[PDB]
Swiss-Prot record, chains B, C, D:
Changing I82L: In strain: Isolate YI, Isolate C1, Isolate AIC-1A and Isolate Tokyo-1. Changing S236L: In strain: Isolate HER1-BR. The intrinsically disordered C-terminal arm interacts with neighboring pentamers. The unstructured nature of this region allows to make different interactions depending on the structural context: pentamers present at the 12 icosahedral fivefold axes bind five pentamers, whereas pentamers present at the 60 icosahedral six-fold axes interact with six pentamers. Keywords: Capsid protein, Clathrin-mediated endocytosis of virus by host, Disulfide bond, Host nucleus, Host-virus interaction, Late protein, Phosphoprotein, T=7 icosahedral capsid protein, Viral attachment to host cell, Viral penetration into host cytoplasm, Virion, Virus endocytosis by host, Virus entry into host cell. It comes from JC polyomavirus (JCPyV). This is Major capsid protein VP1. Its main location: virion. One of its GO terms (cellular component) is host cell nucleus. One of its GO terms (biological process) is clathrin-dependent endocytosis of virus by host cell. It is found in: Virion; Host nucleus. Forms an icosahedral capsid with a T=7 symmetry and a 40 nm diameter. The capsid is composed of 72 pentamers linked to each other by disulfide bonds and associated with VP2 or VP3 proteins. Interacts with a N-linked glycoprotein containing terminal alpha(2-6)-linked sialic acids on the cell surface to provide virion attachment to target cell. The serotonergic receptor 5HT2AR also acts as a cellular receptor for JCV on human glial cells. Once attached, the virions enter predominantly by a ligand-inducible clathrin-dependent pathway and traffic to the ER. The lineage of its organism: Viruses, Monodnaviria, Shotokuvirae, Cossaviricota, Papovaviricetes. Changing R51K: In strain: Isolate YI, Isolate TKY-2A, Isolate MAD8-BR, Isolate HER1-BR, Isolate NY-1B, Isolate N1, Isolate N4, Isolate G3, Isolate C1, Isolate CY, Isolate MY, Isolate AIC-1A and Isolate Tokyo-1.
UniProtKB/Swiss-Prot annotation, chain E:
It is found in: Virion; Host nucleus. The keyword Repressor does not apply. It comes from the Viruses. Forms an icosahedral capsid with a T=7 symmetry and a 40 nm diameter. The capsid is composed of 72 pentamers linked to each other by disulfide bonds and associated with VP2 or VP3 proteins. Interacts with a N-linked glycoprotein containing terminal alpha(2-6)-linked sialic acids on the cell surface to provide virion attachment to target cell. The serotonergic receptor 5HT2AR also acts as a cellular receptor for JCV on human glial cells. Once attached, the virions enter predominantly by a ligand-inducible clathrin-dependent pathway and traffic to the ER. It comes from JC polyomavirus (JCPyV). This is Major capsid protein VP1. One of its GO terms (molecular function) is structural molecule activity. Keywords: Capsid protein, Clathrin-mediated endocytosis of virus by host, Disulfide bond, Host nucleus, Host-virus interaction, Late protein, Phosphoprotein, T=7 icosahedral capsid protein, Viral attachment to host cell, Viral penetration into host cytoplasm, Virion, Virus endocytosis by host, Virus entry into host cell.
Amino acid sequence: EVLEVKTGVDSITEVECFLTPEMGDPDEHLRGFSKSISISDTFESDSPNRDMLPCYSVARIPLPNLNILMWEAVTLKTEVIGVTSLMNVHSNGQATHDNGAGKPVQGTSFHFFSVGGEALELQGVLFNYRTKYPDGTIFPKNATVQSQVMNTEHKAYLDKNKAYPVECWVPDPTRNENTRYFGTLTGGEQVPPVLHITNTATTVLLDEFGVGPLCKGDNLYLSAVDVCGMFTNRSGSQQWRGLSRYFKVQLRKRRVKN
Amino acid sequence: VEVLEVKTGVDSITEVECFLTPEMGDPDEHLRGFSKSISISDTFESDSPNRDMLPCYSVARIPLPNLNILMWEAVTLKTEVIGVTSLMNVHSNGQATHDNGAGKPVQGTSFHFFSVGGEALELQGVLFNYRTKYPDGTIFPKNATVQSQVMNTEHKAYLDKNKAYPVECWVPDPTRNENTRYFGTLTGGEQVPPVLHITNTATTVLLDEFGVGPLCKGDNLYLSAVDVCGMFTNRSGSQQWRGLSRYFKVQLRKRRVK
Amino acid sequence: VEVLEVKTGVDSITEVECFLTPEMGDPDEHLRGFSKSISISDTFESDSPNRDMLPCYSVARIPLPNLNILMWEAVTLKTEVIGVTSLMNVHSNGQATHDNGAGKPVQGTSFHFFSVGGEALELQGVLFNYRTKYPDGTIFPKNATVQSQVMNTEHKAYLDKNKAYPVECWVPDPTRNENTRYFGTLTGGEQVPPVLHITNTATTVLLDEFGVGPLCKGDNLYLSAVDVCGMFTNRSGSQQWRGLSRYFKVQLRKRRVK
Amino acid sequence: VEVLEVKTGVDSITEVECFLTPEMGDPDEHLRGFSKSISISDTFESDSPNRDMLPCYSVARIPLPNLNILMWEAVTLKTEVIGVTSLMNVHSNGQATHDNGAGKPVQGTSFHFFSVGGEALELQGVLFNYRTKYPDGTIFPKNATVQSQVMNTEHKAYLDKNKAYPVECWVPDPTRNENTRYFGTLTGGEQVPPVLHITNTATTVLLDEFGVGPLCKGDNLYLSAVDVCGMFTNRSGSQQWRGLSRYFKVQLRKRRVK
Amino acid sequence: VEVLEVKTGVDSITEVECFLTPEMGDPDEHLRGFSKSISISDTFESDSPNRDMLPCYSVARIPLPNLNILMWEAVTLKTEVIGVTSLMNVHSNGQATHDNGAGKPVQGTSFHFFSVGGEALELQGVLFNYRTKYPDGTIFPKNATVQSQVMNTEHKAYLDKNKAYPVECWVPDPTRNENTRYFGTLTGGEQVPPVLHITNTATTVLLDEFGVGPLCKGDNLYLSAVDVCGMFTNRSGSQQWRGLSRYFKVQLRKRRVKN
């Protein structure tokens, strides 16, 4: 049972941070990029290396210690950080045509963020159930052909960074009562990125009963994916490029019973 | 039916939560969620698609708590496509974008559709080509004539069976469906990019202009869906439909009627 | 006419429900809903399209219950393109997207148009090329001059016959049509993808800024439509227009006038 | 200077209704609505476009009923491009999409613009290339310098003559035009599809934030437009601009001023 | 500062009107508004763009009528890109769309950005490739590391000099800029079509959720912009950035503040 909101100067706080992307980082110079994408000969032989698989980013942020009172997340400001970096079309890129500039980052993107009072809850779904996922990732276990559409065995929490591959996992809509999530997959082999920034846009996190995420143990959970597309180098090889995401969350003290 | 007052009290409401898996053709035991590779007839007259090359409408009849005159009234819907991120597998037997590039993602013609009603969805048959010979095990427009390519009012059916009603033959009958709410988008084009949004913050109200939602005949709720996301292109250039499951959560309340 | 009060009571309203079939040219007995393959003239002066290569406006005059004064007033419209899923037939004599690929779907230039009025839709002629020779059996701008390529006020007509008024020759006349509500979108481009939405939950209100809808002269309602969805490309590369039927449901009420 | 009350009574309102034809260059007696085929200079220094290759702004000065202090205040606008369906002529000396295909439609760069004011539209010159030699018979930015490629405040003009002001070197001057309302969209790209909407149900309000419309000096209303729809490609591959006429309906009321 | 009442009366309001020119690199005396043709490095480690190949942020600091505590408060903005129609010049040393066709227009990657603030726009550095050698005459993220490719909080700056801060290195810092309102859109893709709207009827309100707009420290208003419209392709296939100027009209009112 959720009771009244506490008022007074002491009763509000603000969390501000950036989540870095976890795209695979194939060497010591390539933070923010995946390994070049290679293609299996068959579905049966699909076995991507770890450094080729973008993962969900997650941060657990401690809040001022309370105590029952709980911090309630009320509003969010968020945007992708470094959108202009994608204007570097002069660095080992495959040219658009002879003498032209380098191709920009483009193609499949996934832009996702969530705010919750506990870890984001995940459901596994596989493009191909016979994919061998690599050591160091957490992926759907006991995959069957049903895993290609819905196998309810594949439940997890986003409770580790650099671990849950984006392609295996989505927010579980049957759970996440204490999280608000938002995402868009834009597919297509060379779809153009469209990235907006502004410090004037706010998302309200309150449900239809006027209640936002309530932070269990005085911890706020922030999650993101910002796969912007693929970068094409001069050989034609392509690799995922991600960007960091900014979060500002405003919270207020809420009394609750039981 | 004269519709009267809504019942109140803790026990006056119930909730249905459910996922509908796609029915894309499933051409072998490893390919749930996909169709058979598409092949093209040399003439309109010789068009004879095999069953496993034809996506069909998904449907579920959900029994509700027994009432009797009270009827369960569907008031709100939350819904979304499950597994959107699986379309980021561009390393599994796909045709490369170009020399050394990543695999092409699922793209091209999509149909995204869902409906909620208190009885089976009512269908009207329309055929691209009236001479198409539909296969055994499908339910299709019978006694087709050349008028069936635009409108033949003989072709009426109920979506009353799973893996049966091919998507390309049937649409919701706008002359009926008074006790169902339906929503769908066909986005065509040989390589249109998929755009799939997920969030747990969106709700659709199913009440009509008079404040009445679908009323469940025999305490049965009917959910229907199609989510053809596009086509996957394998290394040989062959293309097959790929579909994804759909989540439904519906809130219902008891309503007295005559 | 001075428009006075709306009549009330159970008898004061009526409903019109119907479908208008497309008139795309119907080049043979198997190709209802298609045009003849498009041929290209060598010069502007030699452009002489055959009748079966020219989509035309559809129109229906629906008689209403006899009233006499009182007039039937059109208040709301539900409308929908019927058979949108038929465009997923990419296996019937289409040109392949690439070697071993599925057939290309209908795509390219579309015109989607509908109007509701109390009299025939008023048309203004505008010609792409004033030297086009239009075929016997069609009604087209007469005495064309070079000014007909931009605006020649001699070209006035009424949409008063089916299978007759070519889409490419005529538009709604914005200088007239006070007693009609019309809505249209031309989406050009050689392969723009169709985007077709269906739902039974959308209504368009036909009342003007003074709260008055179309008033039906002689107790006749006029419905008009074009739904050229794009072009179908067959195995040879030849292209032909494909159209679909449009559903209409109009609510009308009795209105006194003087 | 000082705006006082609006007049009322049956006599206090008037309406202006007209169309502006496009001025695309009209390269011969058969090609009203089209420009000359577009050629490309070898260098910026040699850019010397023909008069008939340059589309121009259209303008109409419309005398209003004599008033005298009272002034006509323009309050609402309805506007529409006339002849949108003419772009469905893909059978008249067009370059085929591919072998045996239909002709390509008009597509590529478009500029759609309209304004309503109580005096001539005020213009600011901006040049793509300051060394362009603009031809005899056009009115263009004089004493051009390299700064004219970004902003040269010397280039001020009034849109006070037809077939004179090339579209490509003039825009509405945002530093002036207090007594005009203007609206325009440049949609660029080598083959972007045209999207043209028509309806007689849409009104634009011309009142500013103080509820004051353009005030017609000397009882003249000024209407201006450009509707370059894209380029038409003939069989040789050569391209020329295609424009259409624009309809205006403006409602005005008498306003007292001191 | 406590924000108190707005002052009223005929002299309590003022207006600022100006245009910011684009700073795209200006590679010779005839190419104001354009960058140098884009060249591509062989490897990430050899990326070394010349200054005239790098578009930069534009900024203007405008002095306001001297006050005095009262501060000018920015309330509304009208803005638009100036010269949108110039992009219809497809007849001047462009690569043809196809044989005998017209010249390709400006297209591909665009960044359209503007901000209004009562102090310099605050910037955060992010690099596509941390080994890029940025040229003399530009102000760029210093002591770059591989972390700079995603987030290195050392890269803080103020947009306080024109023709200096390269667009590709810098973005508005969302952790600061309390006294600025900023808006931008990056539209990527190798040949995305520009869509540019002009009108004198659109206004943006600069007030925050508490009804307070940017407060002008020292009676100065800061305006910033980028309008990289895309790339022009010349007959050889070489591509270069093309930018346009941006108009700003800002309405301000006098606001009393404490301490």
